[PDB]
Design a protein around this ligand. Sequence first.
Ligand code: B12
Length: 601
Amino acid sequence: EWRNGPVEERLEYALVKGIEKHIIEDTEEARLNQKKYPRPLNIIEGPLMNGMKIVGDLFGAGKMFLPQVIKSARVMKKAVGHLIPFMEKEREETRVLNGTVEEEDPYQGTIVLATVKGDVHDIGKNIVGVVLGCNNFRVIDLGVMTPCDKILKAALDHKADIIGLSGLITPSLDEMIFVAKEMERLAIRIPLLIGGATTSKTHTAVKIAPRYSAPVIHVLDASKSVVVCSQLLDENLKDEYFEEIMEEYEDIRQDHYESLKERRYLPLSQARKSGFQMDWLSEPHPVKPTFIGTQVFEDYDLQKLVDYIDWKPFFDVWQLRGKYPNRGFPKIFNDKTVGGEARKVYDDAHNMLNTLISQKKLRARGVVGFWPAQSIQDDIHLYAEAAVPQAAEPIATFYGLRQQAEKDSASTEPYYCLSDFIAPLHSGIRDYLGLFAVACFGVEELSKAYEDDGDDYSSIMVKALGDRLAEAFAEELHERVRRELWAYCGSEQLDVADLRRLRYKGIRPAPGYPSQPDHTEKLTMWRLADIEQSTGIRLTESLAMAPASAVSGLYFSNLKSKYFAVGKISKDQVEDYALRKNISVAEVEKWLGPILGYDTD
Ligand code: B12
């Protein structure tokens, strides 16, 4: 039907509908029309950028969703990959004629995207770097583990017009303020973009924007990048936008400083006197684990993990969200707005997952452990199996945090801590604590192989599938522990439908989570369980677990254990925690940055 149209219309239709079936043949038919395009630069600047501008406009208007944008980007990448020989020939002809290759750039501007030495969320940065290509923007993508000095150096040598940082978590955003300070003290006026769809403007306008004398714009999604980045390149709005409405940082500073008086805190001694007390003499006695030490999983069955995968986080990668009550998997498939695209991505993911779990291209790996645990106030101590806890000495210590923000008198909720879920040493009751770590190996190779091919769609899909497999492995390993390896919940008859609702007994608070935001617990876990040497899950210098598709955490078997948020803490708890950990106050003040209840500046 659409094949009957002219070659320009065929190019536009292929770009908009994401069809690679005839892109090369249509491109050839277009270039053989030499009179219509005297320069091989003209063919891209004409029908090709026209369709991509249409795609970007539709994405910004919300009529086209992310996977179709990715497919359109793939079609344009195929067309450009076919056309590169002719672009290079034209550039060589220009060098022959005018003497040198000119600084002509078909893209509107160059953008450097970087991910800090920390947070490993790579999918969003890649989506941005390819949608800006759909927005006709040249993107220099530095990936994960990019040093700040490397970020600045790449911005300088490549003469980047914009530096884009990536952020998707609350902790470890102190590298963004660090690079902002480095950039400010280097005295460069290049505009800056911040974070992703977890970062509120509070952290931006408190520790970033009043810290740099250049435009610092925060964007929610790359759909609005068409407006946002152009307004940083449109000289009519470049000189005015960056300060006309970014003045609202003034509200963010003054109003929140005024609201700081609303926040109230208890003394740490008073908070301890109001902790989560419980009668261990009437509580059921802890169940002894089946073994003490570490049991290693070397070739875990990927086929089994598929039954435990939850897909709503996976659809959140594609930004597919429905209206209430038809929101989330599996109700997402029936919504008229996103049903077809959700079906497409789900079937593609399942097809590639079936291919991978049958070709053994991936390999799950993990380890679990169990040790006897006794709690000294706000701390957890671990002993050997044969040792007597009251007379021997601990082999590993995990330090917890207690809630300190004052609660309204209408609520009687205790000020929670992790140590409240393990029997105290003086009580005479022996308790046990567990830990685990899982990973999925091979995602960082398949993603790179797909990217070198040019199929960013498959790369993003395989990254999301690796993340899903890692979380499913963590959930399944927790399920085995509660019933087989520890057997403190053997009477349970629940399935994955209730596992997704956190209705099981016990909790697995990962280090760095609001339950205990100190990421240094992973160091003690790795030292105790020999995880790095056994399983192969490395720890980054920022305590990020490699490969990125990895999950780790402790095991608490107490019946009354529940997830909680520490909130905000005062300097009293900071110094107490520092003296318990036998480390300087400066280290604690930087590891617990997000949860500090006072401003040091
Ligand atoms: C997949 C995912 C990951 C992946 C990241 C992908 C990858 N490269 O592997 C991985 C496996 C790394 C993962 C792990 C973790 N993650 Co995670 N993860 C998710 C998840 C499940 C899906 C959401 C998603 O991926 N959206 C797609 C993202 C990647 O793209 P995006 O943000 O939509 O991108 C857009 C905008 O944000 C913006 N944008 C984004 N980046 C940039 C950059 C620039 C320059 C610009 C201009 C714009 C821009 O534009 C984009 C256009 O769409 C969410 C669950 C949820 N609640 O949604 C949790 C979530 C984001 N993860 C989170 C956390 C806690 C973690 C961990 C730290 C857990 C841990 N181990 O302690 C670990 C990291 C450490 C480790 N070694 O695993 C939290 C963050 C909240 C918090 N407490 O801080 C979430 C919300 C889970 C939760 N509900 O609590 N995670």
